[PDB]
Amino acid sequence: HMEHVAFGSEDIENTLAKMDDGQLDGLAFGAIQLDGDGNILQYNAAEGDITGRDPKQVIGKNFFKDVAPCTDSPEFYGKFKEGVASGNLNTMFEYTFDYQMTPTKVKVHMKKALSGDSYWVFVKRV
């Protein structure tokens, strides 16, 4: 009932290109797909369990402006938009999520998706 994909795997963008919503919900880690502006295209069940948000409700919201203002910073949004601009986004770092929630530290892996104007944000607890 799970997709046997590890967080941080070198070819994660190839493995996840085949997955619809149900398959994304089979991952062990949170998975968000953003467009280049930060609008949420996809959001899986594991991420909803980490953050408390409803994966169906967040689609179409802007990550940086709307749902995740704590990521509107050089250390998160800044890294994202630099990787969008280069066309080779691939950066991993720890971060704390603290907006209208118990502060929760995560490991974040942002990586360009194979789909046009699409960027993954992968998430697990630390």
Ligand SMILES: *C(=O)/C=C/c1ccc(O)c(Br)c1
């Ligand atoms: C800080 O504001 C973090 C907010 C947050 C992190 C992760 C997800 O998935 C959401 Br919808 C919000």
